[PDB]
Amino acid sequence: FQETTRVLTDAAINCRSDKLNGLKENVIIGKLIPAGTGINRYRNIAVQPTEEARAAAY
Amino acid sequence: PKLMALELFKPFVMKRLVDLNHAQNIKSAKRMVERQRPQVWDVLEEVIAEHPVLLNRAPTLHRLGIQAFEPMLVEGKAIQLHPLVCEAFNADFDGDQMAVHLPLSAEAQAEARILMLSSNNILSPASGRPLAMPRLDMVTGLYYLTTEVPGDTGEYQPASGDHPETGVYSSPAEAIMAADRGVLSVRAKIKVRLTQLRPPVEIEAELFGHSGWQPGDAWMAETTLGRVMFNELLPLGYPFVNKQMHKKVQAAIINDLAERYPMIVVAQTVDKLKDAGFYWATRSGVTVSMADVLVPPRKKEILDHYEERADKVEKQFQRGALNHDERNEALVEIWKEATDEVGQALREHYPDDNPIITIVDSGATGNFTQTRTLAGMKGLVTNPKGEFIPRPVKSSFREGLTVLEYFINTHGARKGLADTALRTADSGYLTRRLVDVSQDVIVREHDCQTERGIVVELAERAPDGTLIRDPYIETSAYARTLGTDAVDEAGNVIVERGQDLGDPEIDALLAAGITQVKVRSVLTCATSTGVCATCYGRSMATGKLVDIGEAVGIVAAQSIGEPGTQLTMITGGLP
Amino acid sequence: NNSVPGAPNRVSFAKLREPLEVPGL
Amino acid sequence: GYDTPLGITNPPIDELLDRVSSKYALVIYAAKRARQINDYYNQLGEGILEYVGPLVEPGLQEKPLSIALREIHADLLEHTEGE
Amino acid sequence: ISQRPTLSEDVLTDNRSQFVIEPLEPGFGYTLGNSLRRTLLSSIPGAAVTSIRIDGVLHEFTTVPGVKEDVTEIILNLKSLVVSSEEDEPVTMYLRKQGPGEVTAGDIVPPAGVTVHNPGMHIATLNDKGKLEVELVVERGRGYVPAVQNRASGAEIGRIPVDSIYSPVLKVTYKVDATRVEQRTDFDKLILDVETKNSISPRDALASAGKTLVELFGLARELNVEAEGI
Amino acid sequence: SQRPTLSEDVLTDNRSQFVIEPLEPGFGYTLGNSLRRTLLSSIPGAAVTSIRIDGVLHEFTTVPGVKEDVTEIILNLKSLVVSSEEDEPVTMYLRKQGPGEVTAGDIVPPAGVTVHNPGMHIATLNDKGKLEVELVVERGRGYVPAVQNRASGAEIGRIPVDSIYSPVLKVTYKVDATRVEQRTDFDKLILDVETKNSISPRDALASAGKTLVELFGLARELN
Amino acid sequence: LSGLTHKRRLSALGPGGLSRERAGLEVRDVHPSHYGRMCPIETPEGPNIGLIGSLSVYARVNPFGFIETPYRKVVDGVVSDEIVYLTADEEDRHVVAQANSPIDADGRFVEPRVLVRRKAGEVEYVPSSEVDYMDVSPRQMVSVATAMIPFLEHDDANRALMGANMQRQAVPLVRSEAPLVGTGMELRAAIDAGDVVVAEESGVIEEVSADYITVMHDNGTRRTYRMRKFARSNHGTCANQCPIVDAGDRVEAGQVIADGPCTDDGEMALGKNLLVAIMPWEGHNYEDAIILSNRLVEEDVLTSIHIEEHEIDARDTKLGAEEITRDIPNISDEVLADLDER
Amino acid sequence: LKVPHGESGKVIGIRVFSREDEDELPAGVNELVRVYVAQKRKISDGDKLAGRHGNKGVIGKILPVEDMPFLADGTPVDIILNTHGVPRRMNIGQILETHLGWCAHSGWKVDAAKGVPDWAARLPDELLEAQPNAIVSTPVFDGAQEAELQGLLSCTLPNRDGDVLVDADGKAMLFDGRSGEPFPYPVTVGYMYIMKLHHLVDDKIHARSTGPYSMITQQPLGGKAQFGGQRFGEMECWAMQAYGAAYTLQELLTIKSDDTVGRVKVYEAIVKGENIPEPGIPESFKVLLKELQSLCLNVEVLSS
Ligand SMILES: [Mg+2]
Ligand SMILES: [Zn+2]
């Protein structure tokens, strides 16, 4: 946003390790945005045909 | 255009073609595609069966500025488009240009096919009401079709002694055939016998005794063939509508359909209605000619009288008692009164057949002031300082202005151009800042199970009347989730706790006479980060409760920033 | 009143006469 | 209880939402199945039939995602939520 | 030029149909559709009722005694009746009943030739000690003709002409759709829609209409000799 | 009461009127419109396809001795009307030298083709220059863009020209209705057609009739 | 027309002038002293609105640089045929009449009261004697581009400005046609445009050709004019000249001899004449859309010619000098089948 | 040198300048040659048209000549204009221009046997008798009045068929080209001057699937001539975020703009039947890292 040098210095002094939270930073990096279809609640889904379909598939 | 799609689907076409053994390798397939042999068109048609594409009018402003339409091959070098989506992009078909993207992976395909599809975004995000509705031209056609006229050809008549009563048709098919033959005007009073249209509740509860209408039950209606033909477009089961279709009526009907039926049915009926309106607009006989713009009959006498009074005040000033400011005030007020009187006379002159009157009254476009300027008097005009010049124009554009009047008039156009030029940038900057401020708002939890709910006065009860609807209930408490049940005076519950509010529920509450209601709001959300879904309430584009993870900050920013363009002047405008 | 020698003839809805030709543009 | 639609809008959206919890889950819930279908087609020449092919009989050269969406509407798939 | 043959597809329903012609040369869509619709709607011959009589009523202002329905309702009910006739001259038909109950088209005694294709159709209902006698004439024709064209008809007591429907088909609708046979990608695809009565099938109505139109254009063709594509 | 229609001809110098009646009510308009639509776009004909000008490599240039450049002469030649009897590309010649005027009558057509308007003005020549132009005459129907010859990959000396195969010029119809209450309720169609003199109106009408008969024959077959 | 307008343009920005941001908004508005000097209609649509005007039809620059405007002075209520040129200061100090005011053939004012323009923004009737100055023509405040828009007294200011700006964007067609309805300032605006040749002395043409013409002067001196054919214009369009004279005609001096682009018989013609109909048609003309008959396409009614331009150069380098050569490494003969020996 | 993307036509002329022939050239050059390519463009879809009254538009569709409405005498129209845009824009002048154009084209002859009509008092004595395809001129601020047009429209010469098409008001009866039946109400017709704007469609249309990539920014080139892709503004990112679409944004930012190996792999997978591999690390992020590590700021990753 603004005053990049000052905030950069302040963060470096404190060794502020920040998780990839929010959208702007997460889009600057390029990783999936943590919104919509990006939240871990949906990004990790395992889908397989129901056993009934497999028994009756053939 | 094919010249664009073929160059845009090159890898897919090459792959499917080498699959079909029209070439031997990939390089040969690419070369053949480059040469555009007649063996490529079939594969190109086969490879885009259900492949969505992304359109984007530059510059996109709001959420609905990026749609996802199914492609379709057509000749030419222009990207065809649907008439009802131009409003979403605020595009005008006069040289506007939009980009076209394309998702590649199987994930982007599903994303653009489910979420970004156009048919699932009829409702604007600003308010939970549809935006894609008959806008400009087809509305005139619908008004003409549903309009009623007395003493037409083939209208209904009563039994006159030895002659039967004519004007009754067994079914709409016979009426259509009669109209085709040329013995029944499309808009006349008739008594048809419908069989597949639920009658209005007032007749449904009486004729059938509330037993319930079903297809195959006949009832004798009293309407015009145009109204029946229009109602046939509406989805089955909808009660019959038997009133002239002003734009307000159109909006009410569309809103009711959106609030009572699923989105897909609404889209289908909107498409059918648009097609019918386009078909019937051409035959409405709406044109422009010198005989259409008719001069007022007695404007000269009124103008002479007002000029005589102006001369009277001029002599009063010549006496020297008054100063320049008083003279200017007197002149401006006198000429404003004269313009109002001339406008009233012009309105009283025109009949209900002129194309201008038909267009303006039907809400198609414009207002009466433009018609007055075009036929009556343009009146006093603005000045570079903003004050009204003491010299009014005494002629309309039809009759013909003079050099001095046009020179005086140019100022308003110049100032309006400058105002628009500054307003566009002002709105853009404001929208950018508003988007910036609220980037990180997202619905995290499903429910914060909090109790603090802002109380909003739903509708005030008059001291003399029984109940008066609040003029802003449509905005404050229309989609918010009801914090607590609004139990009526008795023990019966009309709306239960947690149940989202809406048009039928708002009507029920109005019937119960409840005035004060406590509603769950997001301002008091107890969620640590973001806001719980329950607090937020019913969504805008979805029509239901918001789903977990959906961004709300961006939507709010876009919604608030979009109307910034029209914001103009302690100032009251955008500043 | 065609100043140029052989311009095409096109009668006009003339009501007033201009006492001077348009100067060299 | 309405006219059958045509194009990519078949099956409709509201019907699918009755199965899936939310529209945001459905997109992945169908994309993963489409990926499995494409993998099965890739191995059709030879391999293990662990990624069972389409459940509903496909059309004439239909995209795998269309097959996934048309079979999800038939309630023939089961999935686990986030992790 | 042979070009490409145009085949007429077909779809089936209870009594409706959606005949499809594909492909057609650019611009021939409407050229077919409009004329074909008009021919189907007002070319096929048929039979229907023209006038009725009620000895129990002197004019039309009132209603027949002892019947729940009104004169206008009776006229409407009897107009929709589907009658097929094979005799050119106008024959008569009588409907008579006594006592309480209902009346159905099948109960009307038909003379030789004429037949009713819907016996279960309702007309009206009678209360106790009710009676009504009707003498309706049936004529064969084409298309639609209003009762106004039958106003001046001799001199009678209670002659009440009714708007007849001399056609077995009553509704037709069509559209045009683009098609891609080649890089032209503009060929039209006619989509016809017809819904006939019970006295004819959509496909036979369409065949009769095509027969009539081809016979009509035979005059244009016969003026000289010259060939074209399929 | 019920009679089949009949078509008769009322003749004029070059535009003929055709009267058709009796037709059932509300049916003349559609028939007239269908005939007009099938007449103005599906009548076979022949017209110049591509030219060859000696001593000229393309169309954006001139030639000494003439008063107008190549584009103007191409535009003028577009008005030329010819009828083809053979179904293959034939070749004509146009050789005119010296001062004077060059008209449509100076072409020496081969056997099987003719030029019916020798009065057209192509261009004019000054004594300095001469002219020799070779042109093709193919038979087609409708309208084709000139670029068709671009992909043939011929030599430099070939110049494509737009082809317009249509002998019909204007068509109109009016209906004389008889809406008396008698069963004589019919309408009388009055169709008027004018041709470019390549073919008489009767031939074009017969061709259109045959086209429509062949097109509608696909429905008379029992389904 | 575009070239003439550009030559007549009046800029207000650039070096030695105010910038866009510092320039006030008020300067972009009209002034009661603009009548007769700078047209108030013609103006760019973009943000440079009001900073780019145009001389009036009759405006002439005085030797110092103050624009003038012709006027005929009324001495004792009688119009004077003789005319004089007045600047802003002198114009303010006098009484200027109205051209459209009726005047008798003898110069007598039929109306006792005639409207008049005063010091600034003041108009009021005055006796028909004190009036001192009268305008020349009603068209004394319009620009050159705006002067050729028929029925300009009926449109709106914004619409008139839009039409004037649009008129400067036409494209030369192949076969131009003069308008059926247009002001009388078309041929004059074309002769002065310079894109049309004209004879200097009254002579008789001996012979004409598509590429050059030869006119014989009455004094026995032969002269020849060369006409450029199909030369790329400064903006990518084409320019040509077609003589409209016949062999053996005594052409008088000042008579046009050839028509340049957008011309038809020595008068401007930027378009064609089409038969229009005003009615909504199946929504294909929805929201400013337009429908065109295929007759225009198949008759070259609106066919234009555009000429591109490319250039390559072989400049020396420290590693050597590049040379254009027919041969090129690793290229099939078919690819270079078009290149010549050089 | 090769023809750019989206050009065609004949080669009309070639100009070559040689230093051997003593031709002035810019310093450091030996042979500069320029080639002119001329193409004939026919008006097509997506082209701008506009009259002299400032009414722009685009060619929505070019119907066949056999489909346009035609006058009662068989004269098909050439262009159709919408009507709802006239009164709102308030440019009624074009209607008068069309009426006057029709009157001049058809030719008129005002009756004078009984005397000049009162409405024709001020008409020039030589303007009472016109010929077909006549030429008329109305100077600005001084032209034919409404009464003049009313009188003229009532005396137009009849067509060669002997009948007059337009009425006194100026409207006429048409015939639909599709249905074939006349419209219920009359319509206005006439000749109006139409120009052609320079905003052609061929210049605008452009496509790009795969082509040259910039060497300094690793991004596709820009512009139609260079055969480069389109720009993707940040407002588009905001819109994509609004819908909650994530993978699409990921692709747009990583797999189609920067990642080299990503582009190669996805192109090969599309060429084959394999699924598109997930994108990688965009070049922008890696450049930002290797640049910020230059300021002594140890920027770790913490994959854990
Ligand atoms: Mg625009
Ligand atoms: Zn909460």
What are the CA-CA distances from residue G238 to residues B64, G119, H193 (Å)? 44, 50, 22
Residue type, B17: L
- What resolution, expressed in A, was reported for this entry? 4.4
Q: Are residues F34 and F66 in the same domain?
A: no
How far is residue H281's CA from residue H262's CA, in Å, rounded to a whole number? 9
- What's the gap in Å between the CA of F204 and the closest CA on chain G? 21
Q: Which residues of H touch E27 (CB under 8 A)?
A: 64, 66-67
The upper half-sphere exposure of residue B175, i.e. CA atoms within 13 Å in the direction of its Cβ, equals: 29
Chains H and C touch (3+ CB pairs under 8 A): yes
Instruction: Name the nearest CA neighbour of B337 among B300, B285, B380, B281.
Output: B380
- What's the gap in Å between the CA of C17 and the closest CA on chain G? 8
Chains E and H touch (3+ CB pairs under 8 A): yes
Residue B4: which of H92, H150, H207 has the nearest Cβ?
A: H207
Q: Which residues of F touch H66 (CB under 8 A)?
A: 36-37, 40-41
User: CB–CB of H137 and C11 under 8 A?
Assistant: yes
Give residue E180 CA to ligand 1 midpoint distance, Å: 32
The chains found to touch A (3+ Cβ pairs under 8 angstroms) are B, D, H
Q: Are residues E227 and E204 in the same domain?
A: yes
How far is residue B102's CA from residue B9's CA, in Å, rounded to a whole number? 9
Which run of H or of E encompasses B311? helix B299-318
- What's the gap in Å between the CA of D75 and the closest CA on chain H? 25
Q: Are residues F116 and F185 in the same domain?
A: no
Which run of H or of E encompasses B275? helix B263-281
Residue C10: which of H124, H136, H143 has the nearest Cβ?
A: H136
Q: Are residues B304 and B393 in the same domain?
A: yes
How far is residue G109's CA from residue G61's CA, in Å, rounded to a whole number? 32
Asked if residue H82 lies in contact with residue B286, where contact means CB atoms within 8 angstroms, the answer is no
DSSP three-state, residue E34: helix
Q: Which of F43, F216, F221 to mutate to test the interface with E (most CBs of E within 10 A)?
A: F216
Contacts with B544 (C-beta within 8 Å, 6 or more apart), sequence order? B538
Pairing of strands B223-224, G258-259: unpaired
Q: Are residues B271 and B160 in the same domain?
A: yes
Q: What is the dihedral of CA F57, F58, F61, F66, to 10 degrees?
A: 70
Q: Are residues B147 and B192 in the same domain?
A: yes
Does the annotation place B447 within a ligand binding site?
A: no
Q: Which residues of G touch B391 (CB under 8 A)?
A: 123
Instruction: Name the nearest CA neighbour of H105 among H78, H132, H129.
Output: H132
Which tokens sit at H300?
Answer: 């770790």
Q: Which residues of F touch H74 (CB under 8 A)?
A: 170-172, 192
Q: CA torsion sign, B60 to B66 to B69 to B73?
A: positive
Residue F71: which of G174, G211, G298 has the nearest Cβ?
A: G174
Q: Are residues B231 and B335 in the same domain?
A: no
Other beta carbons within 10 Å of B192 = 23
- Judged on CB neighbours under 10 Å (0-12, 13-18, 19+), B363 is middle
Identify residues of D whose CB sits under 8 angstroms from chain A CBs. Answer: 24-25, 27-29, 32-33, 36, 52, 55, 76-83
Contacts with H291 (C-beta within 8 Å, 6 or more apart), sequence order? none
Q: Are residues F77 and F175 in the same domain?
A: no
Taken as a whole, chain D contains a residue count of 83
Number of domains in chain F: 2
Give residue B480 CA to ligand 2 midpoint distance, Å: 12
Phi, psi at G85, each rounded to 5°? -110, 130
DSSP tally for chain H: helices H, then strands E? 7, 9
How far is residue B503's CA from residue B501's CA, in Å, rounded to a whole number? 7
Q: Are residues E12 and E98 in the same domain?
A: no
Give residue H101 CA to ligand 1 midpoint distance, Å: 29
Residue H137: which of C12, C15, C16 has the nearest Cβ?
A: C12
Asked if residue B558 lies in contact with residue B62, where contact means CB atoms within 8 angstroms, the answer is yes
User: CB–CB of E76 and B193 under 8 A?
Assistant: yes
User: CB–CB of E219 and F37 under 8 A?
Assistant: no
Q: Are residues E28 and E91 in the same domain?
A: no
Residues 213-252 on G with a CB inside 8 Å of H are: 230, 232, 238
Asked if residue F54 lies in contact with residue F133, where contact means CB atoms within 8 angstroms, the answer is yes
Q: Are residues E144 and E68 in the same domain?
A: yes
Please, which residues have CB less than 5 A from ligand 1, an ion?
Answer: B 92, 94, 96
Beta strand segments in B396-505, E: 455-457, 459-460, 468-469
Does the annotation place B532 within a ligand binding site?
A: yes
Assess whether the previous peptide bond of F64 is cis (omega < 30° from 0). no
Q: Are residues B278 and B366 in the same domain?
A: no
Which tokens sit at G321?
Answer: 């000098």
Phi-psi region of B494 (alpha: psi -120 to 50; beta: other; left: phi over 0): alpha
Asked if residue E94 lies in contact with residue E109, where contact means CB atoms within 8 angstroms, the answer is yes
H61 close to E (CB below 8 A): no
Q: Exposure string (b/e) for F49-82, b if CB count within 10 Å is 16 or more? A: bbbbbeebebbbbbbebbbbbbbbbbeebbebbb
Q: Which residues of E touch H64 (CB under 8 A)?
A: 26-27
How far is residue G2's CA from residue A2's CA, in Å, rounded to a whole number? 48
The upper half-sphere exposure of residue G253, i.e. CA atoms within 13 Å in the direction of its Cβ, equals: 5
The residue behind tokens 């063996």 is: B39
Residue type, G63: P
Pairing of strands H29-42, G113-114: unpaired
The residue behind tokens 């590590």 is: H293
**How large is the C-alpha radius of gyration of chain C?**
10
How far is residue C24's CA from residue G4's CA, in Å, rounded to a whole number? 12
Q: 3-state SS of chain G? A: CHHHHHHCEEECCCCCCCCCCCCCCHHHCCCCCCCCCECCCCCCCCCCCCCEEEECCCCCECCCCCECEEEEECCCCECCCCCEEECHHHHHCCCECCCCCCCCCCCECCCCEECCECCCCCECCEECCCCCEECCCCCCCCCCCHHHCCCCCCCCHHHHHHHHHHHCCCCCECCCCCCCECCCCCHHHHHCCCCCCECCCCEEEEEECCCEEEEEECCCCEEEEECCCCEECCCCEEECCEECCCCCCEECCCCECEECCCECCCCECCCEEEEEEECCCCCCCHHHEEEEEHHHHHCCCCEEEEECCEEEEEEEECCEECCCCCCCCCCCCCCCCCCCCC
What are the CA-CA distances from residue B324 to residues B327, B353, F211, G115 (Å)? 5, 46, 84, 20
Asked if residue G199 lies in contact with residue G250, where contact means CB atoms within 8 angstroms, the answer is no
H181 close to E (CB below 8 A): no
Domain enclosing residue F156, as ranges: 45-165
Domain end point (choices F139, F165, F191)? F165
Q: Are residues F50 and F157 in the same domain?
A: yes
B106 close to A (CB below 8 A): no
User: CB–CB of C13 and H123 under 8 A?
Assistant: yes
Q: Are residues B368 and B270 in the same domain?
A: no
Which tokens sit at H38?
Answer: 């001329």
Other beta carbons within 10 Å of H81 = 25
Proportion of chain D in helix, strand, coil states, percent, rounded to 5? 45, 5, 50
DSSP three-state, residue B493: strand
CATH number assigned to the domain comprising residue F186: 3.30.1360.10
The residue behind tokens 């910034």 is: B564
User: CB–CB of D82 and A44 under 8 A?
Assistant: yes
Q: Which residues of F touch H12 (CB under 8 A)?
A: 58, 60-61
Q: Are residues F144 and F63 in the same domain?
A: yes
Q: Are residues F114 and F99 in the same domain?
A: yes
User: CB–CB of G243 and F143 under 8 A?
Assistant: no
B400 close to H (CB below 8 A): yes
What are the CA-CA distances from residue E142 to residues E36, E47, E164, F80, F187 (Å)? 16, 8, 10, 50, 15
**How large is the C-alpha radius of gyration of chain E?**
23
DSSP letters for B529-548: SS--HHHH-B-SSSSSBPPT
- What's the gap in Å between the CA of G101 and the closest CA on chain B? 11
Does the annotation place B525 within a ligand binding site?
A: yes
Chains B and H touch (3+ CB pairs under 8 A): yes
How far is residue D23's CA from residue F146's CA, in Å, rounded to a whole number? 54
Instruction: Name the nearest CA neighbour of F223 among E36, E17, E3, E84.
Output: E17
Give residue B85 CA to ligand 1 midpoint distance, Å: 15
Q: Are residues E107 and E178 in the same domain?
A: no
CATH number assigned to the domain comprising residue F91: 2.170.120.12
Domain end point (choices F119, F150, F165)? F165
Which tokens sit at H139?
Answer: 């100077």
Q: CA torsion sign, G259 to G264 to G270 to G271?
A: negative
The chains found to touch E (3+ Cβ pairs under 8 angstroms) are B, F, H
Beta strand segments in D4-56, E: none
Which tokens sit at H186?
Answer: 């009359």
Phi-psi region of H141 (alpha: psi -120 to 50; beta: other; left: phi over 0): left
Q: Are residues F98 and F11 in the same domain?
A: no
Q: Are residues B222 and B260 in the same domain?
A: yes
Q: What is the dihedral of CA B27, B31, B37, B42, to 10 degrees?
A: 40
Q: Are residues B403 and B327 in the same domain?
A: yes
Please, which residues have CB less than 5 A from ligand 2, an ion?
Answer: B 448, 525, 532, 535
DSSP β-bridge partners for residue G307: H38
Assess whether the previous peptide bond of B384 is cis (omega < 30° from 0). no
Domain end point (choices E112, E136, E166)? E166
Angle (deg, nearest 10), helices H234-243 and B553-561: 120
Phi, psi at G268, each rounded to 5°? -65, 140
Domain enclosing residue B396, as ranges: 298-418
CATH number assigned to the domain comprising residue B327: 1.10.132.30
DSSP tally for chain B: helices H, then strands E? 20, 11
Which run of H or of E encompasses E137? strand E134-145
Beta strand segments in B162-220, E: 168-169, 189-194, 219-220
Give residue B225 CA to ligand 2 midpoint distance, Å: 53
- A35, closest residue in chain B (CA to CA): B549
Angle CA G111–G115–G119, to nearest 5: 145
User: CB–CB of B548 and A36 under 8 A?
Assistant: no
Phi, psi at F122, each rounded to 5°? -85, -55
